[PDB]
């Protein structure tokens, strides 16, 4: 119960949450893994560079590991190693993990995941904080919500559409419910950066926003592409290849969410292939194979996929004007994330007072470079709060 | 044995082929249908208009029918009701159905299927010819090949890339093997129309081409989208919707064929969702539910999907110049196929000497409107041969 006490000004009741998947669901996962079939080998599945997606070799070995090496129980205990709670907001059950400080002056921060991630993405950073602070000295309140449609959060609604602004509104309400209406900071990557920008733009209690993703076109009023350094041009080139060769999954989520939702719900191996591809291609250094299995299993056991992808019709269907962040705005750049835009471009989308360049790390910043992201966020808060 | 005799000038021996799927394969299929999971209901899968893809209701109903009503054996007997053969070309096993005339002067025609179709698409046309003629009066040789990577054809190769031109080369060589080196005509729709175009462009034994698809953008020289009729502009808008809201599946096939191949091989429910969506959306009048079950089961049992999608790299990554059909060119227009372009546009892409416009019918012309397609084709052949 260390770090678990709600701040003094929270208005909601603490409802402690524990992950406890019944053995039957685990047995059924294994059964469905076993019954699943692998594609016959094809020219494309035999390409070791994986330019056409996951290889037969990888899927074959991952499937065997899932049946024989994988154990949910230690990962689950790890999920349960931090304080978690649920609360209801607009009739939605909203799950969140948290490290709450006992200091009255602690800066409230919400850290926002995306797809195919989750609240667990931030666990390595929570771990560093717990190794390095006590509840008495912890300088921040660290709130890690599950966004509507993900894992232990319910939703989105069945009877109406739901988008990025609805996600933002829920996050702000959580922060308000926990006692943070006088101010909070947002850390956001992936879909959480879209949500974080909206909080910065339109929500008075959001005082500052740090992002590790700024997906954007060339700014209308410049600077132009030719003003970019050779290295920044390499980044734009990587982004353009992502935008042309790497976005088909997102356009399927966007245009046919119901179809792909059913497709990936039918077999755990379908889900692994689709989500596994991104955990392979979107990082700098390869993740442990068990981490991929853990994340995919988490999605499977919570039926996350068909619920989570609603925002794709908004993210993958103004940054200088309507969605310009007037508040203190920070950015951490990791080169192997998918949209490596230059600082000069990012600077046009908000009041950029803080920028950190990194030599390594890909899309899953919190998982891949937890120290660098924690350090960057800490410096940002110390600068602007 | 009727209609099964190879022409006198064939250089290959007949190797008669029969579909015979073992009971164990059907048993495994049924079990995977039963134990594959369905997504929980979402806002998207509750949309009765299906704008987000297949609904929970449809998939649930189709699954119940697949388990309790579907029977592979009568469909299989139907496959086996026309002459079928295999021959080896470039180390590939090439399957084809056929009605061979005993008339020495019979016009050789190959009819080319696409995705998610197969040789059986042309069975209604073959039956109409069989009812109308005897082997001694049949005016055409009707060859219906299975393209590399589909159903009972093997391949494509595991050790090299394979594309549309390779498909054209295989078809042209099959026709030569069967004795038609002095000339043949091609009917093509879907991917078969891309292959059909390449045969008209680059293969001299191909004497004329009839297509029911001509996917293209506005021609440079004319006429402009402005001068088009109201009905033509409505067609342009349907095509434009297809290219923007309806193309994600193809972009996934194109960019990540290995991943989607494995996804859809993992569970027959996955395959049914992905392919069934297209059998629903691409037709004019709804097909019987059992037809979709039959088409999907045929893909499942032959592991067609991962092998067949190789051409998408080229079809979904010139028509007035390099790929202009200088040979007699014919076109059948069915309004609910996916790219309904004006006749004036089509005319810029070949020597268009034949055009038939239809009030009804969608993508799967041979299936949906067999009398119209057979009839258009006969008229075309008699005119140009
Ligand atoms: C919000 C959509 C962003 C993309 C990844 C690009 C960085 C995704 N998660 O599908
Ligand atoms: C070759 C791409 C054609 C499309 C349908 C549009 C007519 C398909 N079969 O994927």
């Amino acid at each position: 119960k260390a770090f678990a006490k709600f701040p003094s000004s929270a208005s909601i009741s603490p409802n402690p949450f524990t992950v406890s998947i019944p053995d039957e669901q685990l047995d059924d996962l294994k059964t469905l893994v076993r019954l699943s079939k692998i594609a016959p080998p094809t020219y494309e599945s035999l390409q070791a560079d994986g330019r056409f997606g996951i290889t037969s070799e990888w899927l074959t070995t991952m499937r065997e590991k899932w049946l024989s090496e994988f154990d949910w129980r230690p990962f689950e205990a790890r999920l349960n190693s931090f304080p978690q709670f649920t609360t209801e907001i607009e009739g939605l059950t909203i799950h969140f993990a948290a490290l709450f400080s006992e200091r009255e002056d602690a800066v409230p921060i919400a850290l926002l995941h995306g797809w195919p991630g989750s609240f667990v993405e931030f666990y390595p950073i929570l771990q560093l904080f717990r190794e390095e602070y006590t509840p008495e000295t912890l300088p921040f309140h660290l709130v890690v919500p599950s966004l509507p449609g993900y894992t232990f959060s319910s939703g989105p609604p069945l009877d109406k559409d739901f988008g990025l602004m609805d996600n933002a509104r829920v996050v702000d309400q959580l922060m308000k419910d926990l006692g943070f209406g006088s101010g909070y900071i947002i850390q956001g990557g992936d879909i959480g950066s879209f949500v974080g920008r909206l909080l910065g733009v339109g929500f008075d209690a959001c005082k500052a926003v740090h992002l590790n993703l700024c997906a954007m076109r060339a700014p209308p009023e410049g600077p132009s592409i030719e003003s970019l350094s050779a290295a920044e041009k390499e980044g734009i080139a990587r982004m353009e290849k992502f935008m042309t060769d790497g976005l088909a999954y997102a356009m399927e989520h966007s245009t046919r969410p119901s179809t792909i939702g059913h497709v990936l719900s039918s077999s755990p191996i379908a889900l692994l292939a689709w989500i596994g591809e991104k955990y392979l291609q979107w990082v700098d250094k390869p993740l442990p194979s068990e981490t991929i299995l853990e994340m995919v299993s988490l999605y499977w056991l919570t039926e996350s996929f068909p619920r989570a992808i609603h925002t794709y019709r908004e993210t993958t269907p103004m940054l200088q004007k309507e969605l310009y962040i007037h508040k203190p705005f920070g950015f951490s750049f990791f080169p192997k994330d998918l949209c490596p835009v230059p600082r000069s471009w990012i600077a046009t989308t908000g009041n950029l007072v803080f920028f950190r360049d990194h030599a390594e790390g890909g899309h899953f910043a919190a998982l891949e470079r937890p120290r660098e992201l924690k350090t960057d966020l800490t410096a940002f808060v110390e600068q602007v709060w």
Side-chain angles (χ1 to χ4, degrees), chain A:
Chain A
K1 295 208 178 192
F3 304 101
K5 181 175 182 179
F6 275 12
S8 65
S9 63
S11 64
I12 55 168
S13 185
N15 292 293
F17 178 82
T18 289
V19 178
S20 185
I21 308 298
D23 274 330
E24 183 179 63
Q25 295 173 35
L26 295 189
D27 299 347
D28 271 16
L29 168 51
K30 180 156 182 173
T31 295
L32 292 206
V33 174
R34 195 182 314 110
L35 283 184
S36 77
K37 296 282 194 171
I38 299 301
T42 55
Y43 172 73
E44 302 98 322
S45 82
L46 294 171
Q47 300 313 292
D49 66 2
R51 73 185 178 278
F52 302 123
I54 56 139
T55 66
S56 284
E57 180 176 76
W58 183 85
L59 198 62
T60 297
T61 69
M62 290 299 275
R63 185 184 169 272
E64 184 50 36
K65 281 170 185 180
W66 216 347
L67 283 171
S68 308
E69 184 191 74
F70 175 84
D71 194 354
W72 177 253
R73 297 294 182 211
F75 174 62
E76 179 180 76
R78 197 185 140 238
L79 297 178
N80 293 325
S81 72
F82 287 102
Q84 310 167 82
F85 306 87
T86 62
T87 193
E88 283 172 59
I89 294 169
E90 300 179 21
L92 306 175
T93 303
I94 300 297
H95 168 268
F96 60 99
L99 287 185
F100 293 116
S101 177
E102 281 171 22
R103 296 189 118 286
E104 206 60 48
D105 75 352
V107 183
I109 314 168
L111 302 84
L112 310 184
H113 77 262
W115 187 99
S118 69
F119 72 98
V120 199
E121 275 188 66
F122 290 102
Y123 267 37
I125 288 167
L126 300 185
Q127 183 60 33
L128 300 176
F129 274 105
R130 170 201 266 161
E131 286 162 359
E132 297 178 12
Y133 286 100
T134 68
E136 297 88 349
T137 56
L138 185 66
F140 312 133
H141 295 293
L142 304 160
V143 184
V144 188
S146 291
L147 295 178
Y150 291 84
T151 75
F152 309 107
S153 277
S154 66
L158 302 175
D159 56 347
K160 62 166 184 160
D161 199 21
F162 205 82
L164 291 166
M165 185 70 74
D166 301 311
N167 279 262
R169 185 187 61 255
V170 164
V171 169
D172 171 83
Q173 192 56 54
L174 176 65
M175 295 304 273
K176 282 170 174 162
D177 285 354
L178 288 168
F180 309 136
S182 65
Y184 59 83
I185 297 186
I186 295 295
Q187 202 296 121
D190 199 77
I191 300 167
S193 67
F194 286 74
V195 173
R197 176 176 289 281
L198 291 180
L199 292 164
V201 166
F203 292 80
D204 280 353
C206 177
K207 304 302 186 186
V209 183
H210 175 276
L211 305 180
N212 65 103
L213 179 67
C214 190
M216 66 181 295
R217 288 166 137 193
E221 253 67 59
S224 59
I225 184 156
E226 50 262 27
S227 79
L228 305 186
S229 64
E232 291 166 341
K233 284 200 200 77
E234 284 197 63
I236 297 303
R238 293 196 305 274
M239 178 176 66
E240 228 279 307
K241 199 215 178 156
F242 175 72
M243 294 191 291
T244 58
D245 181 71
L247 264 189
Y249 78 102
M251 280 306 295
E252 185 66 14
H253 294 176
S254 182
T255 65
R256 298 292 189 270
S258 177
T259 298
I260 191 54
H262 291 296
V263 170
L264 301 188
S265 298
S266 62
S267 166
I269 288 293
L271 189 64
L272 176 61
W274 190 268
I275 287 179
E277 188 203 292
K278 313 310 194 189
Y279 279 109
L280 293 174
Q281 301 188 340
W282 292 359
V283 295
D284 183 357
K285 315 292 160 34
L287 289 168
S289 282
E290 281 288 308
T291 297
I292 298 180
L293 287 183
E294 281 164 10
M295 299 305 207
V296 172
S297 298
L298 175 62
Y299 266 45
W300 175 262
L301 295 165
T302 58
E303 299 173 316
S304 285
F305 180 86
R307 302 190 296 121
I309 62 164
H310 64 275
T311 56
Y312 276 92
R313 54 200 182 255
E314 295 193 337
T315 58
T316 56
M318 199 146 298
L319 293 178
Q320 290 80 24
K321 306 291 174 168
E322 292 96 329
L323 308 181
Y324 184 99
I325 303 168
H326 293 279
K327 294 162 185 170
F329 172 36
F331 198 90
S332 296
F333 176 86
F334 302 91
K336 298 202 178 164
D337 205 343
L338 301 140
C339 300
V341 286
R343 187 181 174 162
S344 70
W345 282 17
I346 295 158
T348 62
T349 72
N351 175 30
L352 186 71
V353 295
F354 181 99
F355 187 88
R356 295 283 183 281
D357 190 36
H358 297 282
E360 30 203 30
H363 167 87
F364 296 97
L367 281 178
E368 297 181 53
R369 316 291 309 178
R371 173 64 74 192
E372 291 172 9
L373 188 60
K374 172 180 173 286
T375 292
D376 285 7
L377 175 64
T378 299
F380 177 68
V381 175
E382 289 173 355
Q383 178 176 142
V384 306
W385 185 275

